[PDB]
Amino acid sequence: KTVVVTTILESPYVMMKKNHEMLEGNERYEGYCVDLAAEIAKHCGFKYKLTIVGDGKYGARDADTKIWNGMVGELVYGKADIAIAPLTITLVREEVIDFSKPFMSLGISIMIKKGTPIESAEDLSKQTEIAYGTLDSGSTKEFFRRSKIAVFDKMWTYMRSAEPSVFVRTTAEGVARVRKSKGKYAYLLESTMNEYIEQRKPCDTMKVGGNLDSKGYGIATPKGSSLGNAVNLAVLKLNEQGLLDKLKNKWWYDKGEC
Amino acid sequence: KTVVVTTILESPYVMMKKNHEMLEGNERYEGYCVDLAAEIAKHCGFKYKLTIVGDGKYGARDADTKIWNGMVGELVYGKADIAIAPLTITLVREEVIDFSKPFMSLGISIMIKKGTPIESAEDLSKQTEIAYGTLDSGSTKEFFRRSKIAVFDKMWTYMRSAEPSVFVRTTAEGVARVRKSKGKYAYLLESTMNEYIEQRKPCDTMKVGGNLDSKGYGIATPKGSSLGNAVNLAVLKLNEQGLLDKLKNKWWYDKGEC
Ligand SMILES: CC(C)(C)c1onc([O-])c1C[C@H]([NH3+])C(=O)[O-]
Ligand SMILES: CC(C)(C)c1onc([O-])c1C[C@H]([NH3+])C(=O)[O-]
Ligand SMILES: [Cl-]
Ligand SMILES: [Cl-]
Ligand SMILES: [Zn+2]
Ligand SMILES: [Zn+2]
Ligand SMILES: [Zn+2]
Ligand SMILES: [Zn+2]
């Protein structure tokens, strides 16, 4: 009866509360997606258990094993009933899981340390002094891996073979690498996160250029899941009444520091 | 076998070619959605007939009759198999028809004649000198009609009773009214269209303030339609390979005039 919700620790979507070690269950977490799960759960009338993805990944299909990892894997293999997280709706995932209409719109963007002489993807692609990468097992990397668009194909060719590896295991590590590389590392990630980090101390990073592509985050459920149909309508409802915009302001700007 | 596609004449989505009177069938039309239908049809392998919505409306449910009009009505009542147009994904429509993942993201925006002293929805709502309205039988009007958000509820209260009526039957009429009202009429419409018009002669209008809400356009099919599942995957594919961004640049900017 209790719906298992898989998610991933990613600020400001899901964060441990400062005093989480004294709390149990869902109360240990806070954030935009934790607030969103709370809303969906009560408006849809069900009990749920928030569970952090074991491997801490969003989800990609291994070429060798053909196995899905991350949150996508938890849904594909029956470990979770719904994923409420900043999970990008993409063709390859849509073939194996169901997504609700987008609860948030965004795009791939470039994060640089302030002062870095880069203003766009074209600039990055036509130079080597500034290394750049993205998150492993995420949609951004798969976007670049499968892209045949000139500029993006060139960036992928560079990234897939760059040494040291330009890929990071977590967004936190990518941001930390941008902050500690003295302008020599640019990080490709979704605009929403880029925007979030831009407003967090030490305020030493910035989003440059426009978005490279346009995507959306949706709540995901196993293919042909009964719950998915209802959740999709619940998300549409929450959006129309301004709850999602309200949540965005609360977690991005009301808590900003720059 | 031939899929009936309902659409609406709305530049730059669907426009009659200059020499359409000498052409027949689908060849009479051109535009972003005509290009999009052409893509979906060949990548999904089907013949189709583009058909303009009889009443020229997007679709709303009459309170008295409870009947759906516009393109939504054509799908609900079996007159068309798919609607390929700038049809906004909304809760009330989602209850009766199926939408693909968004092929375009946008939001409600304000269109004003250049020079009009209005910079936001709050400004409009706290004054009466400048009348403002939206399109009848569209999602923007239903957004305002059902909204309980303070500012939007106040604007709806004003609009529903304003005299002369602030509602227009077509986007063309709303834009014309903005252009001929000498700053005394502001028009609420989706940002994509606002952006389009801003780049068309006489270049006397402009989009002001940020978007009031965030929405998406999806391709619509009758509920539980087999075609919908496949089209949704086709749209996801087209987006990932940059066809939609390519189409946007072609119909909005490559043809701009301001
Ligand atoms: C963590 C986040 C959200 C900033 C992100 O930034 N670049 C990405 O690839 C992702 C993950 C992506 N949303 C997904 O679902 O794989
Ligand atoms: C014509 C267009 C697209 C500019 C528009 O602008 N305001 C609206 O309500 C609509 C129609 C809407 N997209 C719909 O589906 O009802
Ligand atoms: Cl490597
Ligand atoms: Cl009236
Ligand atoms: Zn609620
Ligand atoms: Zn290496
Ligand atoms: Zn094609
Ligand atoms: Zn009247």
Curated annotation (Swiss-Prot), chains A, B:
<feature type="binding site">
    <location>
        <position position="140"/>
    </location>
    <ligand>
        <name>L-glutamate</name>
    </ligand>
</feature>
<comment type="function">
    <text>Ionotropic glutamate receptor that functions as a ligand-gated cation channel, gated by L-glutamate and glutamatergic agonists such as alpha-amino-3-hydroxy-5-methyl-4-isoxazolepropionic acid (AMPA), quisqualic acid, and kainic acid. L-glutamate acts as an excitatory neurotransmitter at many synapses in the central nervous system and plays an important role in fast excitatory synaptic transmission.</text>
</comment>
<feature type="binding site">
    <location>
        <position position="93"/>
    </location>
    <ligand>
        <name>L-glutamate</name>
    </ligand>
</feature>
<feature type="disulfide bond">
    <location>
        <begin position="203"/>
        <end position="258"/>
    </location>
</feature>
<feature type="topological domain" description="Extracellular">
    <location>
        <begin position="117"/>
        <end position="258"/>
    </location>
</feature>
<feature type="binding site">
    <location>
        <position position="86"/>
    </location>
    <ligand>
        <name>L-glutamate</name>
    </ligand>
</feature>
<feature type="site" description="Interaction with the cone snail toxin Con-ikot-ikot">
    <location>
        <position position="145"/>
    </location>
</feature>
<feature type="modified residue" description="Phosphoserine; by PKG">
    <location>
        <position position="181"/>
    </location>
</feature>
<feature type="modified residue" description="Phosphoserine; by PKC">
    <location>
        <position position="147"/>
    </location>
</feature>
<feature type="binding site">
    <location>
        <position position="139"/>
    </location>
    <ligand>
        <name>L-glutamate</name>
    </ligand>
</feature>
<comment type="subunit">
    <text>Homotetramer or heterotetramer of pore-forming glutamate receptor subunits. Tetramers may be formed by the dimerization of dimers. May interact with MPP4. Forms a ternary complex with GRIP1 and CSPG4. Interacts with ATAD1 in an ATP-dependent manner. ATAD1-catalyzed ATP hydrolysis disrupts binding to ATAD1 and to GRIP1 and leads to AMPAR complex disassembly. Interacts with GRIP2. Interacts with GRIP1. Interacts with NSF via its C-terminus. Interacts with CACNG2, PICK1 and GRIP2. Interacts with GRIA1 and SYNDIG1. Part of a complex containing GRIA2, NSF and NAPA and/or NAPB.</text>
</comment>
<feature type="binding site">
    <location>
        <position position="88"/>
    </location>
    <ligand>
        <name>L-glutamate</name>
    </ligand>
</feature>
<feature type="site" description="Interaction with the cone snail toxin Con-ikot-ikot">
    <location>
        <position position="61"/>
    </location>
</feature>
<feature type="site" description="Interaction with the cone snail toxin Con-ikot-ikot">
    <location>
        <position position="237"/>
    </location>
</feature>
<protein>
    <recommendedName>
        <fullName>Glutamate receptor 2</fullName>
    </recommendedName>
</protein>
<comment type="similarity">
    <text>Belongs to the glutamate-gated ion channel (TC 1.A.10.1) family. GRIA2 subfamily.</text>
</comment>
<feature type="binding site">
    <location>
        <position position="190"/>
    </location>
    <ligand>
        <name>L-glutamate</name>
    </ligand>
</feature>
<feature type="site" description="Crucial to convey clamshell closure to channel opening">
    <location>
        <position position="118"/>
    </location>
</feature>
